[PDB]
Amino acid sequence: LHFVDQYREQLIARVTSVEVVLDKLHGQVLSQEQYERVLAENTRPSQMRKLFSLSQSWDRKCKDGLYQALKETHPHLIMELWEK
């Protein structure tokens, strides 16, 4: 969803449970080689930013999945992001 795209750089610096947020993206939006690639990054935003690098091929299925996982992980953020 263009939501992750629009409020993109804001997620890079606010998504906290990056680990568990990628756990959900594992089986469908991002491959195995990708899963550990973005997981390799040390810091939270370094990891989060690495993830968005892969968006180049995300469709309403992928960009939506990411959104979905985010909403489950931490709702208060995307809820505050919409009010913005």
Which three-class secondary structure state does DSSP give residue 1? coil
Find the CATH number of the domain harbouring 34: 1.10.533.10
Host domain of residue 18: 1-84
- The CA-CA-CA angle for residues 57, 62, 68, to 5°, reads 150
* Residue 10 to residue 42: CA distance in whole angstroms: 19
Domain count, the chain: 1
Helical spans, DSSP H, in the chain = 2-6, 8-12, 18-25, 32-40, 44-53, 62-73, 75-83
Instruction: Give the experimental resolution in Å.
Output: 3.1
Structure method: X-ray
State how far the Cα of 44 lies from the Cα of 50, in Å rounded to an integer. 10
